[PDB]
Write a protein that binds this ligand. Structure first.
Ligand SMILES: Nc1ncnc2c1ncn2[C@@H]1O[C@@H](COP(=O)(O)OP(=O)(O)O)[C@@H](O)[C@H]1O
Ligand SMILES: Nc1ncnc2c1ncn2[C@@H]1O[C@@H](COP(=O)(O)OP(=O)(O)O)[C@H](O)[C@H]1O
Ligand SMILES: Nc1ncnc2c1ncn2[C@@H]1O[C@@H](COP(=O)(O)OP(=O)(O)O)[C@H](O)[C@H]1O
Ligand SMILES: Nc1ncnc2c1ncn2[C@@H]1O[C@H](COP(=O)(O)OP(=O)(O)O)[C@H](O)[C@H]1O
Ligand code: BEF
Ligand code: BEF
Ligand code: BEF
Ligand code: BEF
Lengths: 51, 69, 522, 509, 525, 48, 106
């Protein structure tokens, strides 16, 4: 569950969407976030794993 | 409780004397200009007034006195 | 358990907070619950002084933010808008209702038990009530003034109470018609004037306007026999509802075009002049004294008293009194839809001109009335007007319903006694606390004696000492420490109130008995 | 940016946060559930037992706690009676399902273990079924009325509700066509139920008071048009090159206004309801046709009068038709005292049903309708689905002793799950006894014996002494409710049980 | 460590309660504060106190209804007795001090009665029953021959005391101008018409009264205006003198050369056309009231026609009522039945200020007149217009029958009343006796207040008046300018009756409100 | 504008009350906190 | 006292009502007591186990009850007479449970 720092929550097991809600500080990390959302384009599943 | 806080009041001999002796002020300043041995005054209001008129009015206008009496 | 930053409330403590609060509003209001009440001065933020004795007034003027208290008000407020009186006497009833409900509750009795005890007695007390009323004929001057002088008193104008009492009833009567039937207290205009004292007010069998007619060369001062045209079109040069450009072809066309507007003036002034209808009342604003119109002055150049900027609500109050169909527009105008009035005097004070249609109508029976609420200071024309709202409506609750109740707390003393006497009717440990509601109801009588000075226990006792067989009507006399009945003092109080109030009180405090937590927030 | 709690160390903070919300609803249960005065912002101040409003005006910081307070309204819309219960079940459902998390192998073995639960339980929840005649609905509609401050007049409301339901009147009744005015004062027994529409609309015809107070056999025209000098939609500008084309234009104004109502009176109209106000000119030209006119009527309102009257709302009067005018008996604007109000009723086979209430302050009245809705709705639930369940917590104890039976009859390490779901359903009646105790606990085992060989029904009375029998008692909750309340209670916990980490920030990136 | 008393019953923000008895002691003093300040103000031989507006303006008066007008009070109780004086100055000109003086005193003396043991309700009925006896008793205590109104004979006799009250020492000369401006209104009459115009320069004694109003403005039309005529016939009208401008949307469009080459001329045409038309009518003077056009002003100057710039909408009226003409919208179409003759419209200048006038009439004689007050102090010239408006209000009452009934002022009546009111309570059984004997001594104000003004030993003035019940009129009073106690009859000093009755009522009315209230719930901010 | 719930019965400075059942649920957990920390400590094959 | 006072009764009235009943209630009291002999083990332990209960040690209340009376008795002497509860030392030890306490004749 990710908190919108305003109370609001969001429960998810998806790796892609979960990493997006993280904010991805730094080039190396965000680089993986970018690699994640690539996987959905190829496929749609496994974003959690490719990273 | 009245009166409203705050506004000054002088009841008594106060205003009775602190108005005559207060009017005397401006009346003590101009009391030098008059007649052959005149004493013209100069005064700088806000900004460069730099005006020197012996006209008692012209003078008493620049003092811009605030006192009632 | 709690997401923090909130204000829950412990069970047993809640009732305290509720009761102790609720019970206290009455503490401030009981100083007005009686004809021997105490007048208050309410200095507002801006500094405006309002003098009143009216519970509702106080409740609406004073700043109330209480969770419990703020509710008690929202009931007497609704009780005034509906019933029309007994404002304070409702907050009190909830006070001693909880006062007594807490006592037995603090010693074990369940809140839900007394919560039943409430509605239990409620019904049965609504019974005695419907059995305590008196059938009253229709249209009786003395029988009505007897009710007016009962409400229109207990006011600051105690010396002059029998002065407003007549002015109160006379007007109402002039409103009540039998269609069928239906009164319309909204259709009796009340305009306050600033002169003399609170007194010097004059009940008017007609309508008094604030409109004015400022024409030195014109503006007739009076009309002995003036016909009245109820119209409502602009007394001014309007403009197309579409983008507008008037272009002058030549330099001369200028003067020539300045007539294309005045043509749109006379266009209606013509149809109005032909009807030669004399005095006119255009609902449309001029407004008051200042132009437009210049041509409006020309309309009064034909010696035609006319005032504009009339009040919308007072235009209907015009057709009935005037007896003339207020033609909205003049396309289908005639000469029938005019009216008449024996006198029209637009008397003016200083710079304000009040147009009075005195002796007006006489025809159509003069259904809309207007009482002039004169008075020098403002705080005066404040309470005086606030008293009529509670005065007219008061007597109009008799005419509304053919029921009346003996005053001086008749059902108050009676309902408790019936409750105190036979309690077998109902059963369970519940009814065992219907005694609460019982002793409760005695809330009005008690304080009534208190507001006078004479011991509240002795006087109310002197009533518990009168017994016999027959009409058996008894009440307390705030005058002397004695117990003169209300059946003879003509001091009574409407049923429409007692029923729609005794249901209000026991409908809130019962919710209060019910509640466990009053969680708050930010 | 921020930290995050994960693992069991957090899995817990999810559960105990769930139990937390339910803790504030234990008092509310039907029997002697005491009203809760909740002060809120801005200056709102409500009071009652209706879960989806006692929680609604109550904000919560935690995620789990925010999921629970959601099931409240998540349930109220679907059936609209299981407000207080769904929360009380959802919560306790985890409390007695927690020690099987750590002692249990995983949070996912419990998931599958819950499906076999809701499946079986919904079955048992169907065993105790009753048939609704479709008069006798007044028997069930009594129950919705009973908890809140409607018991004092349980009768008066049950009828006022099944009647409002009766008017419309479609296979599916939309309470969007059932207005509910709430006049202050009078007596709670004074809450009539007009078969038309009540309007705060004062003396119509703002021109003058000439328009009829009420009319017998009125032939209404309800319009969404403006009825005033129309302006060029296409941004147009005027050029008065002439000398007196100004007066002629001024005329073109009053002209179109007359031509407007001209073709509207052709429908022999004697009363018109226009969503928008009318110009004084067009207010007079028709006034000479002795026809009434009320303007400013609300968009939604002119749809209630659309079914009551029978006339269809039409725009642009030019293409008006005879099928646009309606047939309603009368229009009398009686004063509510100091404030006016135009009433309009009658018309055969009319769906609309405005049930004006009375009683005490505007707040008192509120809680009345607040619970009235619980009634009105509870009957549709039973009307759209004609079958009922053995209330009084009996239904609950049933699926409890039934699942419990399935417990031992299970060979697996995930046995400790079905068990939990069961034990938690027993708590449904638990408070029924605890709200009228002491004491709830002794009576528990009483029902267990009865259910085993005491037949399906028979639960706890809310009188209350203790044990009773609901079919005899007369408290039957429409299956539809109990069905979804249990389902709402179980699934949300499952989603929440699926959670093992909580992040404390969002991109959203 | 502790302790702290909790709060018995809470409320919103902050509110102020006031126990009734305590408030009465407390608020009866607040009232008493503005009393000692209004005492020295009433009467001729008294004093005037300066006041500086919240805007800084300086104001000096003798009138107590104005002292409070410029005063920002806070005390809800004092607010009342201030609303009194103010709610009188409008309805009746003079008598604004007898309001406060009594009001305050009534409260002052009622204290004793409230402390003795009486109750507010008892105190009210007491005073009230006296207001009905004091109002009637006076209706017959008059004895002052209700003089008929004519010329300046009766006017100057009444209008003087109304003036000599505050602007003492100029009584004679002052009122002279008043009565003067009055007798220029041919007798229902409007008080408002007599406007006043004061202009700096010289001593007040050099003021004058002209039949017609004065304008502190120059005649438009530049050096093309006459500014000097003889018995010219005037014609006043509102509508703008310039071209007929489009009240609604309107401009000027031209297509071809002929258009432009002529449009410029067309204006000139209409212009002269409009003007000459009105000039031929014999119009010797056009008083513009709204808008002036230079385009067409070209015409009016040449023939020899005056032009008075556009005054205020409200000043055109009072002007017209002088000329005899009548205003008329739209330009042109003049009507001789709407024209008016003006004696002289010259341009004189006082204090070196360009000014036009309507002074003197051969003649038609103006229906409204104005007083020209020359002075040396902006402040004094203002508190002279006041002493005038007071007078203008005294002639407003004498003009409405039968208020023209005189009455022994100068304390005379306010002293005889002392005993006359005593007897009533002297012979009225009950507890209300006290509440009456108080209302009586309450009238000790006017007597003493006059004496204390002149340095007269008050301990002698009072006893003397008591001995002098003479009943000759009375016949008995006190003039600060003599020895012992003076005689009203002699000085020709008498205060109009109805004014006193209004004062004696508004005070007994206000004083009752202050007494009536028990608790005051004042807010904050 | 309002509102605000007053305080039922006052006292000195600040003090903390605890309804017994609520406290038991609440304090039984506090206890439970140091439990999961002492579990892994006991016994040989454990942790420090 | 407030109830009747809130409805009119004077504070000074009930203030008398107080001492009024006070005396007369001190009478019934002096008439409700029971003469008791001196030095009776069972008659004393009957009073000890009445006070020394209502304590946290309810299971063990009849455990302190004896230890309570035995000691006191050992103090009361007839000089004449005079007990001295100050002359019976109580020193707390830290061991076992609240129980495991031992009355000491010394
Ligand atoms: N010779 C006098 N001429 C005019 N007034 C006099 C004379 N002698 C005394 N007075 C006082 O002047 C009047 C009152 O003063 P005034 O300031 O006008 O009070 P108010 O205007 O409120 O009535 C008289 O009634 C009297 O008391
Ligand atoms: N020849 C003179 N000798 C002495 N004093 C003179 C003479 N001529 C004029 N004065 C004085 O000067 C004049 C007064 O003017 P004053 O008001 O004092 O200032 P100002 O001359 O600028 O107006 C008078 O005429 C007189 O008092
Ligand atoms: N003459 C009377 N004597 C005693 N009680 C009265 C009398 N007249 C009215 N009452 C009581 O007091 C009234 C209710 O509240 P109150 O503030 O005193 O006046 P109101 O509610 O009519 O404005 C009722 O009319 C009645 O219960
Ligand atoms: N007297 C009762 N005893 C046991 N169960 C009841 C009783 N009355 C109603 N119920 C059932 O329990 C349900 C759950 O409560 P709910 O209606 O959701 O909120 P509340 O009971 O507080 O109004 C219903 O009220 C109803 O179907
Ligand atoms: F989250 Be899965 F991998 F799409
Ligand atoms: F003062 Be009542 F109650 F209106
Ligand atoms: F909350 Be219950 F349904 F009224
Ligand atoms: F004092 Be009065 F008003 F001149």
């Amino acid at each position: 569950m990710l908190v919108d720092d305003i109370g609001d929550f969001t429960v998810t097991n998806d790796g892609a969407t979960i990493l997006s809600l993280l904010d991805v500080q730094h080039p190396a990390g965000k680089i993986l976030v970018e690699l994640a959302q690539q996987q959905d384009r190829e496929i749609g599943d496994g974003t959690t794993s490719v990273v | 409780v009245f009166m409203n806080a705050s506004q000054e009041r002088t009841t008594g001999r106060q205003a009775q004397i602190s108005n005559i002796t207060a009017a005397k002020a401006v009346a003590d300043v101009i009391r030098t200009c008059l007649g052959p041995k005149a004493m013209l005054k100069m005064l700088l209001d806000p900004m460069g007034g730099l005006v020197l008129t012996n006209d008692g009015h012209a003078i008493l206008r620049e003092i811009d006195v605030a006192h009632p009496a | 358990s709690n997401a923090t930053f909130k204000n829950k409330e412990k069970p047993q403590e809640v009732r305290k907070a509720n009761i102790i609060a609720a019970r206290s509003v009455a503490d401030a209001i009981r100083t007005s619950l009686g004809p021997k009440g105490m007048d208050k001065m309410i200095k507002t933020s801006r500094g405006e002084i309002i003098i009143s004795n009216d519970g509702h007034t106080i409740l609406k003027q004073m700043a109330i933010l209480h969770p419990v208290a703020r509710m008690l008000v929202e009931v007497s407020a609704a009780q005034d808008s509906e019933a029309g009186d007994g404002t304070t006497s409702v907050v009190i009833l909830t006070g001693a209702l909880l006062g007594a409900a807490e006592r037995l509750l603090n010693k074990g009795i369940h809140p839900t038990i007394i919560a039943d005890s409430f509605q239990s007695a409620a019904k049965r007390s609504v019974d005695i009530l419907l059995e305590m009323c008196h059938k009253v004929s229709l249209s009786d001057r003395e029988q009505l003034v007897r009710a007016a002088s009962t409400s229109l008193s207990s006011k600051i104008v105690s010396q002059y109470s029998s002065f407003l009492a007549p002015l109160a009833v006379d007007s109402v009567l002039k409103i009540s018609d039998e269609n069928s039937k239906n009164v319309d207290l909204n259709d009796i205009r009340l305009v306050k004037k600033v002169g003399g004292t609170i007194d010097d007010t004059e009940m008017i069998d007609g309508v008094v306007l604030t409109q004015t007619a400022i024409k030195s060369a014109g503006g007739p001062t009076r009309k002995e026999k003036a016909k009245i045209g109820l119209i409502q079109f602009q007394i001014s040069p309007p403009k197309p509802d579409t983008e507008n450009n008037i272009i002058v072809n030549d330099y001369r066309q200028m003067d020539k075009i300045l007539k294309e507007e005045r043509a749109y003036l006379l266009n209606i002034c013509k149809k109005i002049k032909k009807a030669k209808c004399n005095v006119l009342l255009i609902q449309k604003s001029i407004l008051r004294d200042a132009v437009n119109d210049l041509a409006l002055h020309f309309l009064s150049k034909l010696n035609i008293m006319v005032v504009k900027d009339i009040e919308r609500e007072e235009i209907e109050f015009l057709s009935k009194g005037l007896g003339c169909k207020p033609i909205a527009d003049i396309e289908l105008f005639t000469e029938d839809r005019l009216d008449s009035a024996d006198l029209v005097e637009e008397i003016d004070s200083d710079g304000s001109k009040i147009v009075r249609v005195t002796g007006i109508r006489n025809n159509n029976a003069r259904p809309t009335v207007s009482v002039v609420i004169r008075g020098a200071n403002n705080m005066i024309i404040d309470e005086t007007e606030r008293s009529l709202h509670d005065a007219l409506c008061v007597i109009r609750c008799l005419v509304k319903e053919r029921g009346l109740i003996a005053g001086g707390g008749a059902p108050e003393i009676e309902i408790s006694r019936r409750l105190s006497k036979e309690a077998r009717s109902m059963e369970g440990v519940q009814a065992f606390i219907w005694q609460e509601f019982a002793s409760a109801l005695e809330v009005i009588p008690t304080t009534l004696a208190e507001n006078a000075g004479l011991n509240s226990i002795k006087v109310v006792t002197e009533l518990r000492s009168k017994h016999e067989n027959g009409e058996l009507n008894d009440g307390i006399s705030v005058r002397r420490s004695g117990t003169t009945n209300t059946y003879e003092e003509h001091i009574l109080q409407p049923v429409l109130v007692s029923t729609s109030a005794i249901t209000l009180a026991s409908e809130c405090v019962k919710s209060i008995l019910r509640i466990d937590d009053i969680a708050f927030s930010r | 940016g921020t930290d995050a709690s994960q693992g069991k160390g957090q899995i817990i903070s999810n559960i105990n946060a769930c139990v937390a919300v339910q803790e504030a609803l234990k008092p509310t249960l039907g029997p002697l559930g005491s009203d809760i005065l909740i002060v809120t912002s801005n200056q709102k101040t409500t009071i009652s037992n209706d879960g989806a409003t006692i929680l609604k005006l109550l904000d919560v910081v935690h995620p789990a706690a925010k999921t629970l307070v959601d099931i409240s309204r998540a349930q109220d819309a679907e059936v609209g009676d299981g407000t207080t219960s769904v929360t009380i079940l959802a919560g306790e459902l985890m409390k007695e399902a927690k020690p099987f998390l750590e002692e249990g192998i995983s949070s996912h073995l419990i998931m599958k273990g819950y499906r076999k639960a809701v499946s079986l339980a919904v079955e048992k929840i169907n065993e105790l079924a009753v048939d609704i005649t479709s008069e006798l609905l007044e028997r069930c509609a009594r129950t919705a009325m009973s908890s809140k401050l409607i018991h004092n007049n349980a009768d008066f409301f049950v009828k006022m509700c099944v009647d409002a339901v009766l008017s419309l009147d479609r296979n599916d009744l939309d309470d969007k066509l059932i207005g509910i005015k709430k006049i202050p004062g009078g007596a709670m027994e004074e809450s009539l139920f007009i078969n038309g529409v009540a309007f705060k609309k004062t003396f119509s015809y703002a021109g003058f008071e000439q328009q009829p107070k009420k009319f017998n056999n009125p032939k209404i025209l309800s319009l969404n048009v403006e009825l005033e000098l129309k302006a060029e939609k296409d941004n147009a500008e005027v050029r008065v090159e002439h000398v007196e084309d100004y007066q002629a234009i001024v005329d073109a104004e009053w002209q179109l206004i007359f031509e407007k109502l001209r073709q509207v009176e052709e429908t022999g109209a004697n009363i018109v309801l226009s969503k928008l106000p009318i110009g004084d000119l067009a207010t007079q030209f028709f006034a000479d046709r002795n026809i009434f006119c009320a303007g400013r009527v609300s968009a939604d309102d002119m749809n209630r009068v659309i079914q009551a009257v029978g006339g269809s709302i039409q725009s642009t009067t030019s293409d008006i038709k005879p099928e646009h005018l309606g047939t309603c008996a009368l229009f009398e604007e009686m004063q509510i005292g100091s404030e006016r109000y135009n009433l309009f009723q009658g018309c055969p086979q009319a769906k609309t049903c405005t049930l004006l209430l009375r009683g005490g302050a505007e707040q008192v009245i509120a809680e009345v309708e607040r619970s009235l809705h619980d009634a009105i709705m509870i009957v549709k639930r039973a009307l759209q689905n004609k079958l009922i369940v053995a209330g009084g917590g009996a239904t609950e104890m049933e699926v409890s002793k039934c699942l419990r039976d399935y417990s031992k009859t299970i060979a697996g390490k995930q046995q400790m799950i079905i068990n939990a779901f069961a034990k938690a359903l027993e708590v449904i009646p638990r408070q029924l006894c605890e709200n009228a105790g002491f004491d709830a606990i002794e009576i528990l085992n009483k029902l267990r014996l009865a259910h085993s060989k005491g037949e399906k029904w028979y639960g706890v009375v809310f009188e209350t002494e203790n044990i009773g029998d609901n079919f005899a008692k007369f408290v039957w909750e429409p299956a539809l409710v109990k069905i979804n309340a249990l389902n709402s209670a179980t699934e949300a916990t499952n989603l929440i049980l699926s959670v093992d980490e909580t992040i404390t920030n969002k991109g959203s990136e | 460590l502790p302790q702290n008393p909790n709060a018995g019953l809470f409320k919103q923000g902050y509110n102020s309660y006031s126990n009734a008895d305590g408030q009465i002691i407390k608020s009866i003093a607040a009232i008493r504060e503005l009393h000692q300040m209004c005492l020295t103000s009433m009467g001729p031989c008294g004093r005037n106190k300066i006041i500086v507006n919240h805007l800084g303006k300086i104001i000096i008066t003798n009138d107590a209804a104005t002292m409070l007008r410029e005063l920002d009070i806070v005390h809800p109780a004092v607010k009342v007795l201030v609303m009194a004086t103010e709610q009188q100055k409008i309805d009746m000109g003079d008598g604004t001090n007898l309001v406060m003086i009594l009001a305050g005193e009534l409260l002052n003396v009622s204290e004793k009665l409230i402390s003795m043991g009486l109750s507010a309700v008892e105190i009210i009925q007491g005073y009230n029953m006296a207001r009905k006896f004091t109002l009637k008793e006076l209706d017959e205590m008059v004895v002052g021959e209700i003089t008929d109104k004519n010329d300046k004979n009766e006017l100057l006799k009444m209008i003087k005391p109304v003036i000599s009250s505050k602007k003492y020492g100029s009584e004679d000369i002052l009122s002279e101008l008043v009565s003067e401006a009055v007798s220029h209104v041919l007798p229902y009459f409007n008080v408002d018409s007599i406007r006043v115009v004061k202009i700096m320069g010289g001593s007040l004694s050099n003021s004058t009264v002209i039949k017609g109003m004065v304008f502190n403005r120059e005649p438009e039309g530049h050096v093309k205006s006459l500014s000097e005529d003889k018995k010219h016939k005037v014609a006043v009208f509102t509508c703008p003198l310039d071209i007929a401008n489009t009240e609604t949307k309107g401009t000027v469009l031209l297509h071809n050369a002929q258009e432009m080459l002529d449009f410029s001329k067309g204006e000139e045409k209409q212009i002269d056309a409009m003007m000459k038309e009105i000039a031929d009518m014999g119009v010797e003077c056009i008083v513009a009231g709204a808008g002036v056009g230079e385009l067409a002003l070209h015409y009016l100057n040449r023939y020899g026609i005056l032009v008075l710039k556009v005054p205020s909408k409200f000043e055109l009226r009072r002007l017209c009522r002088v000329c005899g003409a009548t205003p008329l919208p739209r330009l042109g179409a003049p009507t001789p039945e709407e024209l008016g003759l003006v004696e002289t419209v010259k341009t004189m200048e006082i204090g070196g200020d360009r000014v036009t006038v309507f002074k003197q009439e051969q003649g038609e004689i103006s229906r409204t007149s104005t007083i020209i007050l020359r002075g040396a102090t902006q402040n004094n010239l203002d508190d002279i217009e006041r002493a005038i408006d007071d007078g203008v209000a005294a002639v407003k009452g004498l003009m409405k029958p039968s208020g023209g009934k005189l009455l022994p002022g100068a304390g005379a009546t306010e002293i005889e009343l002392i005993s006359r009111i005593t007897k009533y309570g002297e012979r009225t059984p009950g507890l209300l006796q006290l509440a009456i004997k108080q209302f009586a001594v309450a009238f000790e104000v006017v007597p003493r207040t006059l004496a204390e003004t002149a340095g007269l030993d008050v301990n002698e003035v009072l006893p003397n008046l008591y001995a002098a019940h003479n009943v000759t009129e009375p016949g008995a009073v006190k003039t600060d300018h003599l020895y012992k106690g003076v005689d009203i009859d002699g000085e020709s000093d008498e205060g109009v009756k109805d004014i006193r009755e209004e004062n004696i009522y508004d005070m007994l009315a206000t004083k009752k409100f202050a007494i009536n209230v028990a608790t005051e719930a004042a807010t904050t901010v």
